[PDB]
Amino acid sequence: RLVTLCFNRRGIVALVFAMVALYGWYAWKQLPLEAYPDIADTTSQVVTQVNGLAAEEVEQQITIPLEREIMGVPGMHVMRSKSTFGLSLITVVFKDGAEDYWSRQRLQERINGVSLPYGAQPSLDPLTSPIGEIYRYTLVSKTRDLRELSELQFWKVIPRLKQVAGVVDVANFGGLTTQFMLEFDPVMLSKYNISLNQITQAISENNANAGGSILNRGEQGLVVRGVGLIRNLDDLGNIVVPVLVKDLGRVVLGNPQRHGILGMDRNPDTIQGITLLLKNENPSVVMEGVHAAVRDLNDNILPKDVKVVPYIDRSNLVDATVHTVGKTLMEGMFLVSLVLLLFLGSPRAAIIVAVTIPLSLLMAFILMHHFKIPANLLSLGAIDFGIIVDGAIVVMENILRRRERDIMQSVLQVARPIFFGMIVIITAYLPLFAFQRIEYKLFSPMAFAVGFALFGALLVALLLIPGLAALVWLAPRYESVLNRLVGSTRTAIGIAVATLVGVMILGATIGRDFLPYLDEGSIWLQVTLPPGISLEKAGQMADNLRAATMEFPEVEHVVTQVGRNDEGTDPFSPSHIETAVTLHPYSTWTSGRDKQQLIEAMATRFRDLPGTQVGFSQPMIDGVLDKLAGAHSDLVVKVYGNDFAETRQVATAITRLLKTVPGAQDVIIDQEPPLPQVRIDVDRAAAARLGINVADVMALIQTGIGGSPVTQVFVEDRSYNVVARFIGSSRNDPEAIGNLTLTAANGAHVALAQVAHIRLAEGETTITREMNKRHLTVRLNLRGRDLSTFLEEARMRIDKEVPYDRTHIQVAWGGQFENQQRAQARLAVILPMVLALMFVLLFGEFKNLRQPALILMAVPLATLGGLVALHLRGMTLNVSSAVGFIALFGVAVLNAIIMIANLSLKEAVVRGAGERMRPVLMTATVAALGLIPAALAHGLGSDVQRPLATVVVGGLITATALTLVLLPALYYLIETR
Amino acid sequence: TQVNGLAAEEVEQQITIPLEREIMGVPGMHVMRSKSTFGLSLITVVFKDGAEDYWSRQRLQERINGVSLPYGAQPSLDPLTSPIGEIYRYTLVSKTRDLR
Amino acid sequence: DVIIDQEPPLPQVRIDVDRAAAARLGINVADVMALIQTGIGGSPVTQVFV
Amino acid sequence: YLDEGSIWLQVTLPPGISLEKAGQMADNLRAATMEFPEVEHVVTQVGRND
Amino acid sequence: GQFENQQRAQARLAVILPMVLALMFVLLFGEFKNLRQPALILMAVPLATL
Ligand SMILES: [Zn+2]
Ligand SMILES: [Zn+2]
């Protein structure tokens, strides 16, 4: 048909595929690439930051009435709220299909128009993915101290980076926020007869400038203005309170309560920042921009001694992924070309078949460009060109073997079975298109790239290729085993059935997981400290931990983040550390251990550390795990109910129980035990007898101890706060606070201990609520075992060996298990449906109804090697492995089609099978040896497609081993009976 | 942001600059300029090509609100329109009335 | 047509509150500011709805 | 080009001038422009809009 | 200024300008199958330019 008009097009079609190749190049160049695809489903958080409030106060008086509004939001999937000291954090994760800015507008519509009595203004966190951390930088200097570095961060580095297109915000960590401060003794306020209310209502009475509009003199108008704005620390001392504010206790620089403390190698205190890309923006480009920005800072904007340098960069992961995938695919192409050169005699011809490889890819890139399909280098890691090139094989086998005039005839003869074989392959990838969410967002471009390559393969195998112009002992041995296939149908069905039961036994018992760990270039650490710890002590424990990590030759820079960032994104207390461990290049390691083994070594090492429990993650996967269900972990056990102590008890029981089960590895109770509080309970009776308003006491507490800013000072473009605070030991303890004074209606200083009863009681550190219900969480990561097997052995012992209930407290599970199960169900729904469609496709070509049955039931022959590989290699059955089975089944049923199409009763079978031996063995060989180099372990971005490749290769070995023996025997057993 | 009587330097200092600080990270922004002067601060933002209108204005709106606002000034986005979009220019004319 | 765009700086009467003298006579800077705010240029005390 | 049916003018005056004086400047600009037989209307906007 | 558009467009066409004349070359080569001839007919472009 087209192969007729093709020959005289020899010049034209060449230019066609050439310019098309160029358009494919431009397609790739304009095709945004992703090393680590965005895993996390659409979600957003509302951050209400209340200055001084305790955890309980935040939860009850802020978080809950916010929950009442947020609860009925459109597209709501799960709504959780963590309320910690000075912070109310509401994480809302939405359903599948809700876009970002939409749901953002919805939450924004909910959280506005609320009350929030403390002046708390709820706000949505930056719009970014949990994988959004790209440039993590620390600005360093060998002279300048922390405060100067902090100023440089705030007023130089932050805005400059924030200008970068693609960057939503840059989160600030550590450092010192500078404020103008007044340090004075209450004995002095009792000395000069001044109330604590008066001094603050004074210092903040006047800070301002005033426009006086326009004053007319002659024909020239003059703007009337005036300046009362305090420009410095000295201007503060002169506020009237002839007693000066400076004659009153000293006026100096200071900082508010530190929300977080950061450290790096041998550096207990420093400052860093975290660049957040905006949502769906391609990381590498935004990284080019931020690279330009950073170098613009270091070379130009920042002082000579201060230089911003990153401890974490996404472009590095990108480059490592690029190198690994590049080397892999290059090796694949080389092996295909090599084996092609080995089977096919003529080298030039082998090249003619070889040019099918780059062209069909360039065919696909044009489509992926116009369909806006991104290129995930990890999923595109498995292609192997043992599918795409098969179409070029069967014709080349057809032509050449037919020769040793008009080639279009035999090309036409082989045109029908290969085209339907092509459709069979592309329809076999239907279940990949079927599944949704994470696994889709991961594997999607592979299925499209292959399918579009299949269409591009036919374009090469027809409009180009035909228009281009030890086996000796393998032959009779094959005739010998086909000769053994005569009759013996009982022993033959013995073999077939034994193989079926084989994959049954081997398949039924095996590990069932979700994803193969998706290695990154670092390690994230979740550390929990003792309850009620000061920032200083937390920083010291962080120092010791960080120093214990640096002991390892594999680590490079250990960054420890104590508490939470100044932005309010993380609901972390001072009792919590997040440690970023950046490993050296894997080749530089002088210790033999693999990353997992290093993980175990670090774990066992940290077990010898005082007051520290360390869970293990990687930064991005940690983010998406956090967004997934309850916490940062592979799995969680949630204990519901409104009683904190009760849920605490049961959660301790389950916490201790999970440590018994082999699968579970890192087990923590999550929310820290309650911390010591000094509780001031105002007695209104005594307040009535002494004539004291509660507002006075509350103000004394907030401004006296806390130092909530009284006014705001403006200096140049910069601004700071101004705070009047009791000095040092003024409050060291309950007794001192009791002896503090405030005014009265009768004009006499009264100690608050005469009115407000001061006691000591512990209270919850962080209150977590899932869907308007209070609960606690047991965080657990599992390592060294299977997920499904672990929930098999555990999850029973929880419902058996753990006594609970009476009043409320019901348990529950969460983490990646629910995700894996959803994917499993979604796969098993579309799985039988595609079997039926491929059953009609097989019924279309042969139209005997026997061949569809036989060929479609040739699949378990392929399943064998898929299972023996995953068992022998020690791998696990998962999404990637499942995909492996998909592709494997595709090439298996294709090879069955090709074999049977060409298939003296049993002699017809022997000769018929013999004729088709070469292209079957060849296509099998190239398809296996295609994904063989992708089974090479070492690399970054290396393991996604590794199990895919394993299943494909092993499965293909056994599929081909069986199909050249069992298949024609079964054929002979049916068609002759 | 229109605040009457306030001088130029104070308009830049206490109004324009913080508003700019909260605006800057705005999604898909091309160039932001600001002119600060007696009576008001005008912050103009042009967006990278291919940006929807109500989208952009929703972003700007999502930024400017919830800020300092010393003098009671209330930042508000100018009417959605185009430089070529003033289609009618009229005058009120009467012999028998006055400007009030 | 070539100009400097933004015009040269205008004359202004600058009222700078002296902190020391404000301490000596006991005056809040707020009093003075609001004096040149409400008193001189003027600020609306309230709104009348007819 | 791409001319419309009109001519627009960007005018800068002495710095910090009174709005009344600038009003008079506008008046002289209009009066001087109207001397052209080709112009039907000359509209001056001094200051800004509301 | 306005040149921001100019330098954007001047390069813009310059990217796709040879691209279409290379595509036109493909077409002309398609029907005639000659090499010299579509080159000669492609030489008609500067003739009109004058
Ligand atoms: Zn985080
Ligand atoms: Zn910010």
Residue type, A568: G
Q: Would you list the DSSP string of A533-564?
A: --HHHHHHHHHHHHHHHTTSTTEEEEEEEEE-
Beta-bridged to residue A768, according to DSSP, are A82, A775
Rounded distance, CA A804 to CA A809, Å?
7
The sheet that has A251-254: what strands, in order across it? A251-254, A179-184, A718-726, A711-715
Q: Would you list the DSSP string of A223-234?
A: EEEEE----SSG
Q: What are the percentages of helix, strand and coil residues in chain B, rounded to 5? A: 30, 20, 55
Give the residue from A961, A855, A2, A813 showing the smallest Cα distance to A465.
Answer: A2
Residue type, A888: L
Cα A821 to the center of its chain, rounded Å: 19
Domain match, A501 and A538 both: no
Instruction: Tell how many helices (H) and how many strands (E) occur in chain C.
Output: 2, 1
Inter-chain CB proximity A219 and D18 less than 8 Å: yes
Method: X-ray
Residue type, A607: R
Smallest Cβ–Cβ distance between C12 and the set A207, A225, A239 belongs to A225
Is there a contact between A342 and A944 (Cβ–Cβ < 8 Å)?
A: no
Domain match, A723 and A794 both: no
If one counts the domains in chain A, the total is 3
Domain match, A803 and A668 both: yes
C36 to chain B: nearest residue by CA? B5
CB atoms within 10 A of CB A774: 18
A877 DSSP 8-state letter: B
Ligand 1: distance of its center to the CA of A627 in Å? 10
**Dihedral, CA of residue A908, residue A911, residue A912 and residue A918, to nearest 10:** 170
Shortest Cα–Cα distance, A211 to chain D (Å): 16
Shortest Cα–Cα distance, A259 to chain D (Å): 45
B64-92 burial, b at 16+ Cβ within 10 Å, e below that, comes to bbebbbbbebebeeeeeeeeeeeeeeeee
Ligand 1: distance of its center to the CA of A132 in Å? 10
Inter-chain CB proximity B8 and A223 less than 8 Å: yes
Domain match, A428 and A558 both: no
Instruction: Tell how many helices (H) and how many strands (E) occur in chain B.
Output: 3, 2
Q: Which residues contact A931 (CB under 8 A, 6 or more apart)?
A: A332, A382, A384, A386, A945, A948, A949, A952, A953
Inter-chain CB proximity D17 and A221 less than 8 Å: yes
Q: Please indicate whether chains D and E are in contact, defined as at least 3 beta carbon pairs under 8 Å.
A: no
A659-688 burial, b at 16+ Cβ within 10 Å, e below that, comes to eebebbbbbbbbbbebbebeebebeeebbe
Beta-bridged to residue A261, according to DSSP, are A562
Give D12's contacts in chain C (Cβ within 8 Å): 3, 7
Inter-chain CB proximity A238 and C20 less than 8 Å: yes
Shortest Cα–Cα distance, A699 to chain C (Å): 22
CA distances from A744 to A199, A689, A737, A749, A752 (A): 15, 11, 17, 6, 11
Smallest Cβ–Cβ distance between B10 and the set A159, A165, A211 belongs to A211
Ligand 1: distance of its center to the CA of B88 in Å? 54
Look-up of token digits 């595709």: A890
Is there a contact between A790 and A798 (Cβ–Cβ < 8 Å)?
A: no
Is there a contact between A675 and A530 (Cβ–Cβ < 8 Å)?
A: no
Smallest Cβ–Cβ distance between E33 and the set A11, A16, A19 belongs to A11
Give the residue from A628, A630, A622 showing the smallest Cα distance to A671.
Answer: A630
C40 to chain A: nearest residue by CA? A212
Is there a contact between A383 and A949 (Cβ–Cβ < 8 Å)?
A: no
Inter-chain CB proximity D17 and A222 less than 8 Å: no
Is there a contact between A572 and A529 (Cβ–Cβ < 8 Å)?
A: no
Look-up of token digits 């909910």: A110
Chain A residues contacting D, CB < 8 Å? 214, 216, 218-222
A125 DSSP 8-state letter: P
CB atoms within 10 A of CB A177: 18
3-state secondary structure of A522: strand
Bridging pattern class, strands A179-184 and A718-726:
parallel
Maximum C-alpha span of chain C: 56
Q: Which of C24, C32, C33 to mutate to test the interface with A (most CBs of A within 10 A)?
A: C33
Q: Which chains does chain A touch, 3 or more C-beta pairs < 8 A?
A: B, C, D, E
CA distances from B95 to A509, B26, B98, B100, D44 (A): 99, 51, 8, 13, 20
Inter-chain CB proximity B70 and A208 less than 8 Å: yes
Domain match, A158 and A296 both: yes
Q: Would you list the DSSP string of A54-114?
A: -HHHHIIIIIHHHHHHHTT-TTEEEEEEEEETTEEEEEEEE-TT--HHHHHHHHHHHHSS-
Beta-bridged to residue A915, according to DSSP, are none
Rounded distance, CA A546 to CA A264, Å?
8
Chain B residues contacting A, CB < 8 Å? 3-10, 13-14, 17-18, 21, 24-25, 27-29, 38, 48, 55, 58, 62, 66, 68, 70-71
Q: What are the percentages of helix, strand and coil residues in chain D, rounded to 5? A: 30, 0, 70
Rounded distance, CA A424 to CA A858, Å?
14
A17 to chain E: nearest residue by CA? E26
Rounded distance, CA A824 to CA A514, Å?
9
Rounded distance, CA B62 to CA A126, Å?
11
Domain match, A846 and A963 both: yes
Q: Which of A198, A201, A204, A206 to mutate to test the interface with C (most CBs of C within 10 A)?
A: A206
Q: Copy the structure tokens of residue A609.
A: 């550390």
B55 to chain A: nearest residue by CA? A101
Rounded distance, CA A667 to CA A664, Å?
7
Last residue of a domain, one of A763, A781, A805: A763
Phi, psi of A89 (to 5 degrees): -120, 115
Rounded distance, CA A222 to CA A213, Å?
8
C38 DSSP 8-state letter: I
Smallest Cβ–Cβ distance between D12 and the set C7, C9, C10 belongs to C7
E29 to chain A: nearest residue by CA? A12
Shortest Cα–Cα distance, A15 to chain C (Å): 55
Give C7's contacts in chain A (Cβ within 8 Å): none
**Dihedral, CA of residue A430, residue A432, residue A435 and residue A440, to nearest 10:** -140
A219 to chain D: nearest residue by CA? D18
Inter-chain CB proximity D15 and C8 less than 8 Å: yes
Q: Please indicate whether chains E and B are in contact, defined as at least 3 beta carbon pairs under 8 Å.
A: no
Q: Which residues contact A382 (CB under 8 A, 6 or more apart)?
A: A446, A883, A887, A931, A934, A945, A948, A949, A952
Q: What are the percentages of helix, strand and coil residues in chain A, rounded to 5? A: 50, 20, 30
Is there a contact between C41 and A224 (Cβ–Cβ < 8 Å)?
A: yes
Q: Please indicate whether chains C and E are in contact, defined as at least 3 beta carbon pairs under 8 Å.
A: no
Shortest Cα–Cα distance, D4 to chain C (Å): 20
Helices (H), A371-472: 390-403, 408-428, 430-434, 437-463
Q: Which residues contact A229 (CB under 8 A, 6 or more apart)?
A: A207, A208, A209, A713, A714
Give D21's contacts in chain A (Cβ within 8 Å): 219-220
Rounded distance, CA A290 to CA A284, Å?
10
Is there a contact between A938 and A370 (Cβ–Cβ < 8 Å)?
A: no
3-state secondary structure of D10: coil
Q: Copy the structure tokens of residue A98.
A: 């809700």
Rounded distance, CA A180 to CA A722, Å?
5
Residue type, A534: S
Domain match, A61 and A108 both: yes
Domain match, A219 and A276 both: no
Q: Is A614 left (phi over 0), alpha (psi -120 to 50) or beta?
A: beta
Exposed/middle/buried for residue B94 (C-beta within 10 Å: 0-12, 13-18, 19+): exposed
Give the residue from A122, A121, A45, A42 showing the smallest Cα distance to A82.
Answer: A45
Rounded distance, CA A955 to CA A861, Å?
8
Exposed/middle/buried for residue A964 (C-beta within 10 Å: 0-12, 13-18, 19+): buried
Q: Which residues contact A94 (CB under 8 A, 6 or more apart)?
A: A41, A42, A43, A44, A75, A76, A77, A103
Q: Which residues contact E43 (CB under 8 A, 6 or more apart)?
A: none
A879-901 vs A859-872: helix crossing angle, rounded to 10: 140
Domain match, A810 and A820 both: no
CA end-to-end distance (rounded Å), chain A: 39
Phi, psi of A750 (to 5 degrees): -125, 125
Q: Copy the structure tokens of residue A976.
A: 């002759």
Ligand 1: distance of its center to the CA of A619 in Å? 8
CA distances from A467 to A20, A402, A404, A456 (A): 18, 16, 18, 16
A699-733 burial, b at 16+ Cβ within 10 Å, e below that, comes to bbbbbbbbbbbbbbbbeeeebbbbbbbbeeebbee
3-state secondary structure of A193: coil
Cα A473 to the center of its chain, rounded Å: 54
Handedness of CA A14, A18, A23, A28 (dihedral sign): positive
Give C30's contacts in chain A (Cβ within 8 Å): 205-206, 208, 228
Handedness of CA B21, B22, B24, B25 (dihedral sign): positive
Domain match, A304 and A327 both: no
Domain match, A759 and A895 both: no
Phi, psi of A822 (to 5 degrees): -60, -45
Compute the C-alpha angle A274/A279/A283, nearest 5°. Answer: 65
Rounded distance, CA A55 to CA B75, Å?
34
Q: Which chains does chain E touch, 3 or more C-beta pairs < 8 A?
A: A
Q: What are the percentages of helix, strand and coil residues in chain E, rounded to 5? A: 85, 0, 15
A269-287 burial, b at 16+ Cβ within 10 Å, e below that, comes to bbbbbbbbbbbebebbebb
A399 DSSP 8-state letter: H
Is there a contact between A774 and A809 (Cβ–Cβ < 8 Å)?
A: no
Phi, psi of A698 (to 5 degrees): -60, -40
CA distances from D24 to A126, A354, A414, C3 (A): 52, 84, 93, 22
Rounded distance, CA A745 to CA A691, Å?
6
Inter-chain CB proximity D16 and A221 less than 8 Å: yes
Handedness of CA A319, A320, A321, A324 (dihedral sign): positive
Beta-bridged to residue A216, according to DSSP, are A221
Structural domain span for residue A390: 1-37+314-513+816-977
Beta-bridged to residue B41, according to DSSP, are B36
Give the residue from A795, A802, A762 showing the smallest Cα distance to A780.
Answer: A795
Rounded distance, CA D46 to CA E18, Å?
52
Residue type, A547: A
Shortest Cα–Cα distance, A373 to chain D (Å): 42
CA distances from A759 to A733, A738, A756 (A): 11, 10, 10
Say which ligand is closest to the CA of A170.
2
Is there a contact between A957 and A865 (Cβ–Cβ < 8 Å)?
A: yes
CA distances from A332 to A445, A826, A929 (A): 19, 32, 7
Beta-bridged to residue B34, according to DSSP, are B43
Ligand 2: distance of its center to the CA of A159 in Å? 9
Domain match, A849 and A943 both: yes
